[PDB]
Ligand binder design. Structure first.
Ligand SMILES: *[C@@H]1O[C@H](CO)[C@@H](O[C@@H]2O[C@H](CO)[C@@H](O)[C@H](O)[C@H]2NC(C)=O)[C@H](O)[C@H]1NC(C)=O
Ligand SMILES: *[C@@H]1O[C@H](CO)[C@@H](O[C@@H]2O[C@H](CO)[C@@H](O)[C@H](O)[C@H]2NC(C)=O)[C@H](O)[C@H]1NC(C)=O
Ligand SMILES: *[C@@H]1O[C@H](CO)[C@@H](O[C@@H]2O[C@H](CO)[C@@H](O)[C@H](O)[C@H]2NC(C)=O)[C@H](O)[C@H]1NC(C)=O
Ligand SMILES: *[C@@H]1O[C@H](CO)[C@@H](O[C@@H]2O[C@H](CO)[C@@H](O)[C@H](O)[C@H]2NC(C)=O)[C@H](O)[C@H]1NC(C)=O
Ligand SMILES: *[C@@H]1O[C@H](CO)[C@@H](O[C@@H]2O[C@H](CO)[C@@H](O)[C@H](O)[C@H]2NC(C)=O)[C@H](O)[C@H]1NC(C)=O
Ligand SMILES: *[C@@H]1O[C@H](CO)[C@@H](O[C@@H]2O[C@H](CO)[C@@H](O)[C@H](O)[C@H]2NC(C)=O)[C@H](O)[C@H]1NC(C)=O
Ligand code: NAG
Ligand code: NAG
Ligand code: NAG
Ligand code: NAG
Lengths: 698, 176, 698, 177
C-alpha cells in the first residue's frame, strides 16, 4: 500500500542478502590478513567489488522512499544510513583523480625515506626508521635532523596533493547536501529526537571548544612540569617561559608524550608495575591470557565467547611459514562469527591489549540482534571508549594482586600512584590539545576560513597558542606538516580519539559509582560486580538504533560531553603538579622560538613586491655569508635553502636567520650575519635598487 | 511390525524449509539416551513415554533451519518461518526433535533456501513450492532490475565456523 | 757464506713456506665465495690475514742482500717483487686514512642511488638498476636522466675523497722510490736485460701514444658510421659533424659500444650466429660445455685437467641452499690445485666464457713449476690476453659447424662476416680510445700536470679530442666523472685492458700462421694444430721468470707491441666502413655540444673575481627566469642548479644556459633567456656595481 | 716357504721421510699387487726374474713422500730429499715401490715434515733427528727472530684435494745385499 508498507519489505530484502556478501567480504579480508602472500589479495578485490557494487546498487534503489512520511524509528534510521553513504555525485575523471591522489598520498607516506646529511646512502624509513629515533634518542641534533628531514622530503611532496585533495573532497561533500568536508565528517554525532532538540553538527565544535577550555589548567600544569624536567636534559635549549620545541616531545609529531616518561619520571627509585617476569615465570601463554580476560569479562556479567572464537581466531604467531600483519584488531566477521587477530607475546602490554580487543569483541557481540545497518557504535567514539575503559580496571595493582601477578609484599605508597597518574596523563592528557588543534585546523581548512596561502602560518600559530609547542625551523607554504601524520595523509577522522577519551572517563566514573567503589577513581576495579555489568550491557546492546545522547543518558545520567570525570581521575596528580609548579611559570608565550634570538628584523619600505623578491634576497644573503666566510679562509657553500624567513608579513617586514649547510641545528650567530651584511652592504641593496633607508636592517 | 522411523533419522540430504516432504511413519530411542540432540522441548503429547499408546495421524517431517528460527517452531507467535515458511496450528499436538550439524550440512556444495517474501498470511500444514517472483504492491513483476519486485527464496549461506544460531540445525517435527 | 750463497737459502725458506700459507688463504677465499653466509667472512681475516701479515714480515727480513752483487736471473727477479711489495712506508694515521678513503669510495659506488624529480621514492642502485636503463633504453630523456643523475648524486660524493686519495697514493709511491703513483702502476711493463736495453717505465707512455695514433683511422670510420646510424634513432639530437653525446653509447660510461649493435646493425635480414637453442635441443648441460671446452685444448697439445678440477670446482648453480656469486673467475689455489667458480647456463656466451676462463687455468697449470714469486703472467696484459685468444678461435662458424652446433646449410656469405666483424669492433675497437685516455687522464693527475682546479676541464677536453664524445651537461669542479667508473673508485689499474687488446691479435696472428691458416684472419681456428700449441705452451711455461719482451719475441718474433695484426683482423670491416662513409664526414670537431647554440656568451670587464660572483650571477639569472615566466602566468621555481655554466675562462668570459627545473633535458630556448635578461637588465648589473658595458651579453 | 714381506705394505702409521726406520725382514706380491703401485722403475736386478735368484740379506724402509719427489728417489741423483733427507748409494740394487693414499693420510690431524736445510751433504743410509735451528753462517742459533736462521723441518701441509703431485705417497724399498 503506502511507502511504509514497501520500505520495510525493501529493508527486509536488503539485510538478509547484504549479510551474506558482507560475510564473504570479511572472510576474504581475514584469509588475506592471516595469509599475506600471492593469490590472497586477488580474492578480496572481486569479493569487495561485488559487495560494494551491490551496496551502491541498493543505494541507487534506496532513493524511492522519503523520510518524511515514515515515522517508526528503526527503518527511518536505516534509510538515513542509506541514501547518503552511497556513490559520490562527481565526474568520472574527478573521482579517478581523487582515488589517484589518495593512493599517491598513502604511497608517499608509506615509502618516504629520509637520508643523513653526512651520509647520503644511510636513509631511514618512518615505521622501522625515524620512529625509533624520535622515541629513543636524547640527542638534540639527531632529533632535529629526524624532525626536519621528515615533512621536508615528504610533506613538500604532499602539499599540492593535499590541496587538490581538499578541493576534490569539498566538491564531493557539497554534492551530499552538506556544506564542507569537515561537516561531512560531522555527520556522526548528529541526532534528532523531538522539536529540534537533537545534536547538531555545529554543536560538536562548540562542545569540543568548551571541553578544551575546561582542560586548560591541568594541561598547562602538565606542560609546565614537563618543561621544567626538560631543562635538566637539553640545557641552554628550552626557555623556562617559552613553548616546548616540536622535536623534543617523544614522537615525530608530538602526539603522545608517553616516551618522555623516563626523562620526566618522579621518584625514580620506585619501580613501576611490570609483571612481565612474574608472568613468564608462571608459564603463561596466549591461551591463558585470553582465558583470564574471558574470566574477567564473565565476572562483571558479560557472557562467554561463541566457541568459534577459540577455534578460528589466531592468537599467537603461527609456527609455519605464513606472513601476517601484527596489528592487534578485533574482527566482527558477521553472521555470529567473532575473531581477534594479533601477534601477542607474554608481556603486560599485550595482556592489556588482549583485554582491549576482547572488550571490542564484547561490544560487537552485543548488537548482533540489530539489523546490519545499525551494527555499529552509537557514534565513532563509544566503540574505542569501551575498548579503552575495559582495560583501565585491569591495570590497577589490586586486580593483579588477586590474580597472583603481583606479590602481596609490594607497597602501594602515594608515590607509585603519582607515577602511574603521570604516565597516564602523558598518554592521555598530553594528546587532547594536539587532537583538538589538528581537528580544528582541518575543519577551518575545509570551511575555507584558512586560505591556501596561510595554511602553515595558521597551523603553527594554533600549535603555539593551543598546544604550547613551537617549531624549531620556520616553515613557509611549501611545507605541509599536517600531512606528515598518518591520519591526515590517509583521510581519517581524528576527533574520535578526543570523544573516546571523554566518553571513556565518563564511563569509568559511572561504572565505578555503580560498582560501589569508595577510594580514588584511579584505583577502581569493576571486577566481580554484576550491577555494573547490567548497565554496561544495556548500553552495549543498542548500537545506532538509538541516538547517542539517549544511550549516554542511560549510563552516566547526562546527555552532554562532560570532562568532570577526567578531572576527578587526575585530581591527585593535579594537586601534586600545582605544588611542583610553585617556583616555576605555568603557561607559555607565543613569541619565543629556537631561532628567535638569532633572527634579524628586516623592514621593507618599497620595487614591486612578489615571491621572487624573497628568492633574490635569500640568494643575496647567501652570497654575503659566502663572502664573509671567504675572508676568514673558511670556504662554506651557503645556499638559498640555508636562509630561513620567518614572521613574513607580506607588506611591511619579515625576519631571517642563516643556518650552516649540512647541519640544520647550526644557526650562524647574529653578530656574524650582521657583520656579513655590513661588509656586503652595497650588493644587498643595489640589486633591489634601494638605499639603506628602505632596508635599514633593525 | 516396527514403525518406519529410521529411514531418515540416520540418513542425509534433508530439504530446506520450503521443500518439506511428509512421510506416513522404535519410540524408545528418541527419549532414552540421544543426548547429542540440541533440544527436547515438546508441546502436546508431553515428554511422557509412548508405551503402547493408541494414536492416529503419526505423520512426521524434517527440514533444515538456520538455528535462531528453531524457537519460531511453536504455536501462537510471530516469525519469518511461521509467517512464510512453516506454520504450526495453535492447538498443536505432536512433538519436535532437533540437533546440531557442525560439519554435516556445511560442505562447499550445499543449497538451502527460505521463502522470505510471499503474499499474505500462511496457514498451518500446506506447501508453497512455486518460485513466482514476489511483488511489493501486487500481481507480478517478471523482471529483476526495477522497484517493487524481489526474489523470494533467499539463501541461508551455510559456511562452516559461523557460531551457534547460524550453524545448520536438522529439526524433525512429529504430529499426533 | 757470502751474498748469493745465503740469499737463495732465505729464498728457499720463503718458497716452501709461503705456498702453505697462500693455500690456506686461497682455500678460505674459495670456501667463502661458494658459501656466501655469516661466520665465513672472517676466515680471510683469520687465515688469510696470517698470510697477509707474513708477506711484509719477510720484506723486513729482505733487503739484507744487495741486488747488484747477485747476477743469476731466477733469484734476482724473485728478490725484486720482494723488497718493494712490503708494508707501505707511511705514518700510522695516514695509512689508516688511506684505508678508510678506499673503503668509503667502494661503499659509495656500490650503494649509490639515483632517481627522478618526480616520484622520488622509485630509485635504482647501479648494477641491477641504471645499467639496465643505460643498456636497453632508446629514450633520449630517460638516458640523460640516468647519466646526469649518476656522477652528481654519486660522483659528487667521490670528488672530496678522490682529491685526498691522490695525495696519499702519491706519498706512498714516493716512499717506494717512484716519482708518483702513475709510475708505481707502471712498475709492471718494466724489464732489464743488458746495457739498459730494457723496457723503461716511461717507454710505456710513448708506445701507447704510438698505438693510439695508428688505430685513429680505424676508429674514426667506426665513429662516423655509428654517428650516421645514430641519426635514424634520436633525430634532431646528434650533429652530423660534431661529437657523439655521452649518454647514447650503450652504457653509463661509454666503455663498450656493444649495446649499440641493434641500432647500428648492417644487413638486419641476415640473422646472427646463435647456438643457444641448438645446445638445449641436443641435451647439453654444465658438464658437457666444459668437457667440449677441454677437448679443444687437448687438440692443440695442451694437457688434460688435473682431475681435482672436476671433483671440486663448481660448474653450475648449487642445488642446496648455498648463496654464491655468479662472476666467472678461474681460481689458482696453489699446490697443484686449480678450480673454476662460475654459474653456467645453456647459452652461447657461457660456452665462450668456459673457453676464456679455462684459458686462465691452462695458463696457471703451465708455470706451476716456477717458484711462487714468478707464478703470474709475464705482465698484467698477457694473463687476460691468453683467455681471449682461445675464445676467439671457437666463435668462428667453422669450429661450431664441426661440433654440430651449427647446421651445415648455414649461409656463410660476406654479409654475415661484416655483422660479426662490426659486433667485435663495437667491443674491441670502440673500447680502445676510452681505455687510453682514462689512463692518460689518471697519469697526468698523478704527475701533477693537471691541477686540482682543472680535473673536470681536462677530462672533457680529452674526451672530445681523443674519443670524440661530448658531454650533454656541463660539469664544473664539483663533479668527479672519472670516479664514477668501477676501476677508478676501487683503485684498479686500467692500462691492463688497453694492452690486452694489442696482445690478443698479436698472439692470434702468430698462432694462425703456425696453424697454416689461408683465408682471412677473422675466420681462423687453431684447433687440431699441435704445432700452434707447442709454441703456445712455451710462452705459457714461463711466467715472471723471463722479461716479457723476450717472451713476446719467442712467439710473435717481435719485441714491441704491434697493432698491425689488429688492423689486419678488421681489414674487411675497414675497407667496408670507408665505402659507407663516402657521403658522410669522417672525424669530429670539439666545439659542438648538446647545450651549444642555446647558451649566451657573457664577457666580464671587471668587482674583484673570487668565485663568489658565480653564485650571484647564477642567482640573478634564476631570478630573471622566475620573473620572466611569472608575467606569462607560468610559475616555475628556477634555482641556481638550473643555470649551467660552460667554457669558463676565469679572466675574460664564460657561457651559460638555463634548463627547466625537474627536467635536465628541457633547455630553455635562447630567445626566451635573452628576453628575460633584457627586461631584468637593471637588477642584473647593479648587483655587481657595473653597467651594461661591463657584461656585454653577446 | 716363508718370506716376511708383510708388516710394511698393509701396515699403517707411516713416518715422515726424515723418520724412516728399517724392518730387517715372496716376489709374487710385487706382481699380484694388493694396492695399485704407481711406479716400478728398477735398475740393476731385473724385475722379471726374481724367484730363481737367491739372496743373502734384504732390508726394507718406508716413509712418506710429497709426490714430486718420487722421481727423485734414484741412485746418483740430486734433489732436496736426496741432498738433506734420504740419499741412495750409486751402486744400488733392488728398487722402490710407491702408491697414492688419497683419503688415508689426508685427515685433519696428520703432521709430516721434511728436512729443508742441513749443514753439508748427507752420505747414503744414515739418520738425522735433532731439531737444531739451521744457521746460514753456521753454528747454532738459540733465537728464531734473527737474521740467517730458519726452521729446518718444514711441513708437507697435506690437505685433501690438492691434485696429483702433492698427494701423500707411501714409498717402500726392498734393497738387499
Ligand atoms: C594461503 O594462501 C595460499 C594461496 O595464496 C594457499 O595455497 C592454496 O591452498 C589451496 C588449498 O585449498 C590449494 O587448492 C591451492 O592450490 C593453493 N595455492 C597455492 C598457490 O599454493 C594456502 O593454503 C593458504 N594458507 C592456508 C593456511 O590456508
Ligand atoms: C572474584 O570472586 C571470586 C570468588 O569470590 C574469586 O575467586 C577466588 O580467588 C581466590 C584468589 O585468587 C582463590 O583462592 C579462590 O580459589 C577463588 N575461588 C573462590 C570460589 O573463592 C576471584 O579471585 C575474584 N576476582 C577478583 C578480581 O577479585
Ligand atoms: C651541528 O650543530 C650542532 C649545534 O651547533 C652541534 O652540536 C653541539 O652544539 C653545542 C651547542 O648547541 C656546541 O657547544 C657543541 O660544540 C656542538 N658539537 C658537539 C659535538 O657537541 C653539532 O656538533 C654540529 N655538527 C653535527 C655533525 O651535528
Ligand atoms: C657453509 O658454511 C656453513 C657455516 O658458515 C657450514 O656449516 C658448518 O659446517 C661444519 C662442517 O663440519 C660444521 O662443523 C659447523 O658446525 C657448521 N656451522 C654451522 C653454523 O652450521 C656449512 O657446512 C658450509 N657448507 C658446506 C657445503 O660446507
Ligand atoms: C679434429 O680432428 C678429429 C679427428 O680427425 C675430428 O674428429 C672427427 O671429425 C670427423 C669430421 O668432423 C667426424 O665425422 C668424426 O665423428 C670425429 N670423431 C672421431 C673420428 O672420433 C674433429 O672433429 C676435429 N675437430 C676440429 C675442430 O676440426
Ligand atoms: C623533458 O624535456 C624533454 C625535452 O624537451 C621532453 O621530451 C620531448 O622533447 C621533444 C624535443 O626534444 C619535444 O618535441 C617533445 O614535445 C617532448 N615531450 C615528449 C612527451 O615527447 C620531455 O617531454 C620533458 N618532460 C619529461 C617529463 O621528460
Ligand atoms: C563460560 O565458560 C566457562 C568455561 O567453559 C564455564 O565454566 C561457565 O559456566 C560459562 N558461563 C556461561 C554463562 O556460559
Ligand atoms: C605522601 O604522603 C606523605 C605523608 O603525608 C607526604 O609527606 C608526601 O609528600 C606524599 N607524597 C606525595 C607524592 O604526595
Ligand atoms: C685426456 O683425457 C682423455 C679422457 O680420459 C683421454 O682419452 C686422453 O688420452 C687424455 N690425454 C692425455 C694426454 O692424458
Ligand atoms: C658481397 O659480395 C657481393 C658479390 O661480390 C657484393 O655485391 C657485395 O657488395 C658484397 N658485400 C659486402 C658487404 O662486401
Amino acid at each position: 500500500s503506502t511507502t511504509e508498507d514497501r520500505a520495510k519489505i525493501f529493508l527486509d530484502n536488503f539485510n538478509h542478502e547484504a549479510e551474506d556478501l558482507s560475510y564473504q567480504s570479511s572472510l576474504a579480508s581475514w584469509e588475506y590478513n592471516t595469509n599475506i602472500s600471492d593469490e590472497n589479495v586477488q580474492k578480496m578485490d572481486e569479493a569487495g567489488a561485488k559487495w560494494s557494487a551491490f551496496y551502491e546498487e541498493q543505494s541507487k534503489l534506496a532513493k524511492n522512499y522519503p523520510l518524511e512520511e515514515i515515522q517508526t524509528v528503526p527503518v527511518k534510521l536505516q534509510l538515513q544510513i542509506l541514501q547518503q553513504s552511497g556513490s559520490p555525485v562527481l565526474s568520472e575523471d574527478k573521482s579517478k583523480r581523487l582515488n589517484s591522489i589518495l593512493n599517491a598520498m598513502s604511497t608517499i607516506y608509506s615509502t618516504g625515506k629520509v637520508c643523513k646529511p653526512n651520509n647520503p646512502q644511510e636513509c631511514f624509513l618512518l615505521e622501522p626508521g625515524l620512529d625509533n629515533i624520535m622515541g629513543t634518542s636524547k640527542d638534540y641534533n639527531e632529533r632535529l635532523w629526524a624532525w626536519e628531514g621528515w615533512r621536508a622530503e615528504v610533506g613538500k611532496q604532499l602539499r599540492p596533493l593535499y590541496e587538490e585533495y581538499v578541493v576534490l573532497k569539498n566538491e564531493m561533500a557539497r554534492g551530499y547536501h552538506y556544506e564542507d568536508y569537515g561537516d561531512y565528517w560531522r555527520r556522526d554525532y548528529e541526532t534528532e529526537e523531538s522539536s529540534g532538540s537533537g545534536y547538531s553538527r555545529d554543536q560538536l565544535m562548540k562542545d569540543v571548544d568548551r571541553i578544551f577550555t575546561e582542560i586548560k589548567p591541568l594541561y598547562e600544569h602538565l606542560h609546565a612540569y614537563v618543561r621544567t624536567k626538560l631543562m635538566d636534559t637539553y640545557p641552554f635549549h628550552i626557555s623556562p617561559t617559552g613553548c616546548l620545541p616540536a622535536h623534543l616531545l617523544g614522537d615525530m609529531w608530538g602526539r603522545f608524550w608517553t616516551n618522555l616518561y623516563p626523562l620526566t619520571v618522579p621518584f625514580g627509585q620506585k619501580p613501576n608495575i611490570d609483571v612481565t617476569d612474574a608472568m613468564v615465570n608462571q608459564g603463561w601463554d596466549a591461551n591463558r591470557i585470553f582465558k583470564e580476560a574471558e574470566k574477567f569479562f564473565v565476572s562483571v556479567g558479560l557472557p562467554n565467547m561463541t566457541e568459534g572464537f577459540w577455534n578460528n581466531s589466531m592468537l599467537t604467531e603461527p609456527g609455519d611459514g605464513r606472513k601476517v600483519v601484527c596489528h592487534p584488531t578485533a574482527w566482527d566477521l558477521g553472521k555470529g562469527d567473532f575473531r581477534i587477530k594479533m601477534c601477542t607475546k607474554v608481556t603486560m602490554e599485550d595482556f592489556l591489549t588482549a583485554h582491549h580487543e576482547m572488550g571490542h569483541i564484547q561490544y560487537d557481540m552485543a548488537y548482533a540482534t540489530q539489523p546490519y545497518l545499525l551494527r555499529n557504535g552509537a557514534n565513532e567514539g563509544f566503540h574505542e571508549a569501551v575498548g579503552e575503559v575495559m582495560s583501565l580496571s585491569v591495570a590497577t595493582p589490586k586486580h593483579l594482586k588477586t590474580m597472583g601477578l603481583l606479590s602481596p609484599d609490594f607497597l602501594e605508597d602515594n608515590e607509585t600512584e603519582i607515577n602511574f597518574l603521570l604516565k597516564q596523563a602523558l598518554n592521555i592528557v598530553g594528546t587532547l590539545p594536539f587532537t583538538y588543534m589538528l581537528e580544528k585546523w582541518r575543519w577551518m581548512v575545509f570551511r575555507g576560513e584558512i586560505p591556501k596561502e596561510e595554511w602553515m602560518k595558521k597551523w603553527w600559530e594554533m600549535k603555539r597558542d593551543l598546544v604550547g609547542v613551537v617549531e624549531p625551523v620556520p616553515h613557509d607554504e611549501t611545507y605541509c606538516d599536517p600531512a606528515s601524520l598518518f591520519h591526515v595523509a590517509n583521510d581519517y577522522s581524528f576527533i574520535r580519539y578526543y570523544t573516546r577519551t571523554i566518553f571513556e572517563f565518563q564511563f569509568h566514573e559511572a561504572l565505578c559509582r555503580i560498582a560501589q567503589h569508595d577510594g580514588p577513581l584511579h584505583k577502581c576495579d569493576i571486577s566481580n560486580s554484576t550491577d555494573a555489568g547490567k548497565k554496561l550491557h544495556q548500553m552495549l546492546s543498542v548500537g545506532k538504533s538509538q541516538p547517542w545522547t539517549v544511550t549516554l543518558k542511560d549510563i552516566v545520567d547526562s546527555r552532554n560531553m562532560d570532562v568532570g570525570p577526567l578531572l576527578r581521575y587526575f585530581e591527585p596528580l593535579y594537586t601534586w603538579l600545582q605544588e611542583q609548579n610553585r617556583k616555576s611559570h605555568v603557561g607559555w608565550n607565543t613569541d619565543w622560538s629556537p631561532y628567535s634570538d638569532q633572527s634579524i628584523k628586516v623592514r621593507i619600505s618599497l620595487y614591486e613586491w612578489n615571491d621572487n623578491e624573497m628568492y633574490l634576497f635569500r640568494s643575496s644573503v647567501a652570497y654575503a655569508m659566502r663572502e664573509y666566510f671567504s675572508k676568514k679562509n673558511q670556504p662554506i657553500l651557503f645556499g638559498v635553502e640555508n636562509v630561513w624567513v620567518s614572521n613574513l608579513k607580506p607588506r611591511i617586514s619579515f625576519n631571517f636567520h642563516v643556518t650552516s649547510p649540512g647541519n640544520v641545528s647550526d644557526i650562524i650567530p647574529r653578530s656574524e650575519v650582521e657583520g656579513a651584511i655590513r661588509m656586503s652592504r652595497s650588493r644587498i641593496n643595489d640589486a633591489f635598487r634601494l638605499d639603506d633607508n628602505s632596508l635599514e636592517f633593525l | 511390525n516396527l514403525c518406519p522411523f529410521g529411514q531418515v533419522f540416520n540418513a542425509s540430504n534433508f530439504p530446506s524449509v520450503y521443500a518439506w516432504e511428509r512421510l506416513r511413519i522404535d519410540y524408545a530411542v528418541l527419549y532414552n539416551s540421544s543426548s547429542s540432540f540440541s533440544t527436547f522441548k515438546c508441546y502436546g503429547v508431553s515428554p511422557t513415554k509412548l508405551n503402547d499408546l493408541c494414536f492416529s495421524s503419526v505423520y512426521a517431517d524434517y527440514f533444515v533451519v538456520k538455528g535462531d528460527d528453531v524457537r519460531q517452531i511453536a504455536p501462537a507467535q510471530t516469525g519469518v518461518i511461521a509467517d512464510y515458511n512453516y506454520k504450526l496450528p495453535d492447538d498443536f499436538t505432536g512433538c519436535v526433535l532437533a540437533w546440531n550439524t557442525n560439519s554435516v550440512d556445511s560442505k562447499s556444495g550445499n543449497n538451502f533456501y527460505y521463502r522470505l517474501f510471499r503474499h499474505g498470511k500462511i496457514k498451518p500444514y500446506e506447501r508453497d513450492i512455486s518460485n513466482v517472483l514476489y511483488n511489493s504492491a501486487g500481481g507480478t513483476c517478471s523482471s529483476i532490475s526495477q522497484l517493487g519486485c524481489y526474489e523470494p527464496l533467499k539463501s541461508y549461506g551455510f559456511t562452516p565456523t559461523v557460531g551457534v544460531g547460524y550453524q545448520p540445525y536438522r529439526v524433525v517435527v512429529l504430529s499426533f
